[PDB]
Scaffold this active site. Structure first.
Site, PDB file in Angstrom:
ATOM      1  N   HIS A  40      52.946  -0.489  -5.565  1.00 36.10           N
ATOM      2  CA  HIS A  40      53.532  -1.011  -4.309  1.00 36.10           C
ATOM      3  C   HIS A  40      52.429  -2.213  -3.569  1.00 36.10           C
ATOM      4  CE1 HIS A  40      51.020   2.216  -1.961  1.00 36.10           C
ATOM      5  NE2 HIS A  40      50.961   1.201  -1.027  1.00 36.10           N
ATOM      6  N   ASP A  84      54.256   4.961  -8.978  1.00 30.69           N
ATOM      7  CA  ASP A  84      53.562   3.902  -7.956  1.00 30.69           C
ATOM      8  C   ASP A  84      52.399   3.470  -8.669  1.00 30.69           C
ATOM      9  OD1 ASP A  84      52.964   2.243  -6.072  1.00 30.69           O
ATOM     10  OD2 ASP A  84      52.524   3.724  -4.581  1.00 30.69           O
ATOM     11  N   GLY A 175      45.861   0.312   3.907  1.00 27.49           N
ATOM     12  CA  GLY A 175      44.803  -0.738   3.319  1.00 27.49           C
ATOM     13  C   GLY A 175      43.900   0.131   2.338  1.00 27.49           C
ATOM     14  N   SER A 177      45.608   1.803   0.082  1.00 31.46           N
ATOM     15  CA  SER A 177      46.544   1.803  -0.827  1.00 31.46           C
ATOM     16  C   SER A 177      46.151   1.190  -2.340  1.00 31.46           C
ATOM     17  CB  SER A 177      47.841   1.073  -0.559  1.00 31.46           C
ATOM     18  OG  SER A 177      48.502   1.556   0.614  1.00 31.46           O
ATOM     19  N   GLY A 178      46.524   1.838  -3.290  1.00 35.18           N
ATOM     20  CA  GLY A 178      45.943   1.216  -4.580  1.00 35.18           C
ATOM     21  C   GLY A 178      44.813   1.918  -4.933  1.00 35.18           C
TER      22      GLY A 178
END
Ligand code: IN4
Length: 223
Positions: A40, A84, A175, A177-178
């Site tokens: 994402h 994801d 923020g 994320s990942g």
């Protein structure tokens, strides 16, 4: 990161910031030329920023390297966030040192109750907004899949786990994320999603990296 602490500069050496003119997601250096992140987080024109602490100040330890390619997992579903996960190849190999190091992939999945370290430059408030310039850290346990499914009825797949606190107050956020969830020296999770941040009975949900180790190894062998 809501309810965390300041990591300390370069104490999380595998943490990357993904920059497209600004930080938009975190990531994890898994070898000198490959980063894992959330599917994402995919966009064009990604520069990988390694060795960062303050993402707004050049402090001396940074390496800025553009991505040559990005590979979103073949079965990523943006509606459900199942699978994801995404791999990014660097145009050039990073120089690995004490402040810039890769994180190992798991040989096995981690159990509920395992303590983990989640880090990132995401929002530090659950209702308000405030983005840190320096890297924030949080230690949090993996939750049972039963509590995970109770919290998120109908939404948790085999490729997901929950981590955090059912009481709220401490969580990853937008923020982050990942970015990495590291447990027992291994990359076990990727900051994926949640309902709000640090809300009671709504823990963080994380991509279950141990399910993807074959895909990761096979992809980087041929790319
Ligand atoms: C896939 O993305 C998501 O699920 C988004 C969502 C954040 C939405 C949000 C944005 C802003 C604010 C605020 N300004 N207070 C709060 C929540 C999100 C992202 C990453 C982790 C978590 C988590 N709970 N571990 C939640």
């Amino acid at each position: 990161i809501v309810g965390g602490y300041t990591c300390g500069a370069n104490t999380v050496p595998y943490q990357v910031s993904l920059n497209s003119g600004y930080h938009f997601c975190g990531g994890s250096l898994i070898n000198s030329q490959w980063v894992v992140s959330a599917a994402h987080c995919y966009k064009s024109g990604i520069q990988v920023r390694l060795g960062e602490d303050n993402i707004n100040v050049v402090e001396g330890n940074e390496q800025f390297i553009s991505a040559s390619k990005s590979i979103v997992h073949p079965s990523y579903n943006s509606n459900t966030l199942n699978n994801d996960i995404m791999l990014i190849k660097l145009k050039s190999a990073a120089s690995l040192n004490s402040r810039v190091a890769s994180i190992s992939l798991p040989t096995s999945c981690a159990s509920a109750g395992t303590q983990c370290l989640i880090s990132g430059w995401g929002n530090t408030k659950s209702s308000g907004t405030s983005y840190p310039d320096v890297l924030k850290c949080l230690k949090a346990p993996i939750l049972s899949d039963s509590s995970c499914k109770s919290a998120y009825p109908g939404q948790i797949t085999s490729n997901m786990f929950c981590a955090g606190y059912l009481e709220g107050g401490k969580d990853s956020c937008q923020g982050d994320s990942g970015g990495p969830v590291v447990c027992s020296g291994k990359l076990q999770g990727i900051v994926s999603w949640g309902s709000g941040c640090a809300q009671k009975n709504k823990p963080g949900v994380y991509t279950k990296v141990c399910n993807y180790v074959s895909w990761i190894k096979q992809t980087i062998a041929s790319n």
